[PDB]
Amino acid sequence: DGYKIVCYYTNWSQYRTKIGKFMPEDIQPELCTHIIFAFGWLKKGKLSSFESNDETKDGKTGLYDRINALKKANPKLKTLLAIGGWSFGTQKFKEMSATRYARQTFIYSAIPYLRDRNFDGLDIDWLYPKGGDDKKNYVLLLKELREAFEAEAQEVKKPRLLLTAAVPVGPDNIKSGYDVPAVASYLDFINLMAYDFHGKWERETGHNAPLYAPSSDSEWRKQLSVDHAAHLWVKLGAPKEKLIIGMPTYGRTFTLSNPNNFKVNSPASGGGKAGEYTKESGFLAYYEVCEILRNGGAYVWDDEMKVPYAIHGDQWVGFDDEKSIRNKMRWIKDNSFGGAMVWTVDMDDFSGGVCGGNVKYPLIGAMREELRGISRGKDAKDVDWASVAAS
């Protein structure tokens, strides 16, 4: 019971190098209440593996089992397998949801797939259903999934498989694809993707996940905040306690058109340069932002948005730190939402050796501390970037 801490683990984090290298055993069993495995896949209309080393074969334990092995040390921990995401696209979801036969084919493939691999549930990450057909068919998919999960539980006399989904924060995306009252009814809980509010696809700097929109925001764009998105879902009929609010352990980066104009909503020429470990322009892991702040980068706290950004030369990154995360946890409690979701567990300072505070998982550890009252350790102090970094 209490607030949830829902952590996404991404299987491609296994390929990162040096400090970035992450494996299932790097997760502390007591860190999260739920771990979601990103991702499974779809083949011939049925739930399947993303990559062969997810599976256990011949002598060799796969990633699925290494993640689920965490439940031996913490029997209260729940695991789910996610299907979807950006690589997956939309066409495969369209075809799988379009007819009852295709939906049932997926569903009766999904139940044994999960049970045989000791998963406690399924997370749907269709990004995104769009238009009237998708809007109806998505509901039909969740309805028939929940239906079948309910029946299975009673027949096998085991706790029912959980059904969850990751959902968008953009008002237009929400309106086009989501019959919210029906969607919420069939889901156990809802992982609100409260990040990617801004990024290199825009011509000015903007924060990845502002709690509140800056005053320099046009009036369309002030809709783009964590606060506005979460309350929009409530207004549309989602129960507050089913809303698990996403928290990014990453930032979105820009290259400033002029290094002297570095505030939020400043002209940008494109994405920030790629980090060594995540190798993606416009994007940095939290521990990559830490490296910047520990090597000459300047830190700005925006008291309007209640989030920080960092500047180094013409490089600009909007990210979340221990300060903004704790304030967001207070906002979760003040609004009675269901808990925090994290994207991802593998981009926090999981080794505890990069950001300088010598605490493993400073960000997620802070979430657990604020929401579930569990200490990060005796002398675990937040990094005060205001004094540590430049200004």
UniProtKB/TrEMBL annotation:
<feature type="disulfide bond">
    <location>
        <begin position="290"/>
        <end position="355"/>
    </location>
</feature>
<protein>
    <submittedName>
        <fullName>Chitinase</fullName>
    </submittedName>
</protein>
<feature type="domain" description="GH18">
    <location>
        <begin position="3"/>
        <end position="374"/>
    </location>
</feature>
<comment type="similarity">
    <text>Belongs to the glycosyl hydrolase 18 family. Chitinase class II subfamily.</text>
</comment>
<feature type="disulfide bond">
    <location>
        <begin position="7"/>
        <end position="32"/>
    </location>
</feature>
